[PDB]
C-alpha cells in the first residue's frame, strides 16, 4: 500500500530504529567472529608449528635412513 | 498607550510558537540521539572488521608456511622405497 | 608453552575489548 | 519587552538548535555510509583470504592421507 | 510532523534548510538499511565459514602430530 505521509519524522526514527537492530545483531555476530577468529589465529600457528615438526621428521627420517 | 493589552497577547502567541518550537526539537533532538547510536554501531563493526583483519593477514602468513611445510616434507616422505 | 602464553595473553584483551563493546550496547 | 524579547529569543536560539541538530545528524549519516562502505570492502578481501585458508587448509589435508602409507614399519 | 519533515513555526529559511537535510538523512537510511542486512548476513557466512576451517584444521591437527608419532617411532 502507498508511501507514507503523516509523520515523515517519526516515520524516519521509526525506519532508523529498526535499522539500529539489525545493527545490533551484526556487531553481535562481529563478536561470535571476533572469538572464533581467535581460535584460528592460534590453532593456525598451533598448526603452522605442528608441521614444522613433521618436516624435521623427514628431513632427518630421509637423511637418516629408514 | 505604547501598546497595553496588545503587548499582552503578542506574548501569549509567543508563548505557543515557543512551545510549538521546543515541541519539534524533541522530535529531532530524539531522532539525533537514535542515529548517534546508530552511527557508533557502524563506527565499531568498521574498526572491528578491521582488527579480525590483522587476524587473517597474520592468519594467512603463517597458514603459507603450514601447508607449505607438510609439503617440503611431503615428499620426503617418499623414502617408503629406499 | 611459550606459544600458549601469547595465545592466553591476546584473547585476554581480545575479551577486554569483547566486554567493554558488548555492555557498550547491552548485550550477553 | 524583557518579557516579549527574552521569549523571542528562546524562539531563535531552540529553532537555531534544531537546525544545528539536522546538520549534525546528516554528518553523522555521511559518517555513518563511508564506514559502511570500507566495512563492507574489508568483509569482501577478507572473505576471500578466508577462502584459500581454506584452500591451504584443503591441500594440508591433501598432502596427508598420503604420508599414511607409513604403513611400512 | 509531516507532509514535510518539518514543521514550518516561523517561516524561515532556518527551517527550509532542516526540511533539505531530512529530505536527505532519511533518504539516505533506507540506505545504510541494505548495507546494515548485507554486512550483517556476510557476519554470519564469513562465521559458519570460519567454523569449517575450525572443524577442518582440527582434523590437520591429528594428522599432522598423530602421524609425526611414527616419525618419532621409526626414526
Known amino acids: ?66 | ?82 | 608453552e611459550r606459544r600458549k602464553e601469547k595465545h592466553r595473553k591476546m584473547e585476554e584483551e581480545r575479551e577486554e575489548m569483547r566486554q567493554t563493546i558488548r555492555d557498550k550496547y547491552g548485550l550477553k | ?73 | ?75
Open chain 2, 1 to 82: 498607550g505604547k501598546s497595553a493589552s496588545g503587548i499582552i497577547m503578542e506574548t501569549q502567541q509567543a508563548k505557543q510558537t515557543l512551545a510549538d518550537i521546543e515541541a519539534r526539537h524533541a522530535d529531532i533532538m530524539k531522532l539525533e540521539t537514535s542515529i548517534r547510536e546508530l552511527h557508533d554501531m557502524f563506527m565499531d563493526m568498521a574498526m572491528l572488521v578491521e582488527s579480525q583483519g590483522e587476524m587473517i593477514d597474520r592468519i594467512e602468513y603463517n597458514v603459507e608456511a603450514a601447508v607449505d611445510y607438510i609439503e617440503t616434507a611431503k615428499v620426503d616422505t617418499k623414502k617408503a622405497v629406499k
Open chain 4, 1 to 73: 519587552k524583557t518579557e516579549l524579547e527574552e521569549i523571542q529569543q528562546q524562539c531563535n536560539q531552540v529553532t537555531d538548535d534544531s537546525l544545528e541538530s539536522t546538520r549534525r545528524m546528516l554528518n553523522m549519516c555521511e559518517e555513518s555510509k563511508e564506514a559502511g562502505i570500507r566495512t563492507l570492502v574489508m568483509l569482501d578481501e577478507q572473505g576471500e583470504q578466508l577462502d584459500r585458508i581454506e584452500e591451504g587448509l584443503d591441500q594440508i589435508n591433501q598432502d596427508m592421507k598420503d604420508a599414511e602409507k607409513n604403513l611400512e614399519g
Open chain 5, 1 to 75: 510532523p509531516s507532509s514535510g519533515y518539518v514543521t514550518r513555526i516561523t517561516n524561515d529559511a532556518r527551517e527550509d534548510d532542516m526540511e533539505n537535510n531530512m529530505k536527505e538523512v532519511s533518504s539516505m537510511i533506507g540506505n545504510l538499511r541494505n548495507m546494515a542486512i548485507d554486512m550483517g548476513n556476510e557476519i554470519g557466512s564469513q562465521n559458519r565459514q570460519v567454523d569449517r576451517i575450525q572443524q577442518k584444521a582440527e582434523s590437520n591437527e591429528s594428522r599432522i602430530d598423530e602421524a609425526n608419532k611414527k616419525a618419532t617411532k621409526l626414526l
Open chain 1, 1 to 66: 500500500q502507498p508511501v507514507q505521509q503523516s509523520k515523515r519524522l517519526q516515520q524516519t526514527q521509526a525506519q532508523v530504529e529498526e535499522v539500529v537492530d539489525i545493527m545490533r545483531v551484526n556487531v553481535d555476530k562481529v563478536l561470535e567472529r571476533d572469538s572464533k577468529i581467535s581460535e584460528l589465529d592460534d590453532r593456525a600457528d598451533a598448526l603452522q608449528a605442528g608441521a614444522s615438526q613433521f618436516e624435521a621428521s623427514a628431513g632427518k627420517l630421509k637423511r637418516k635412513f629408514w
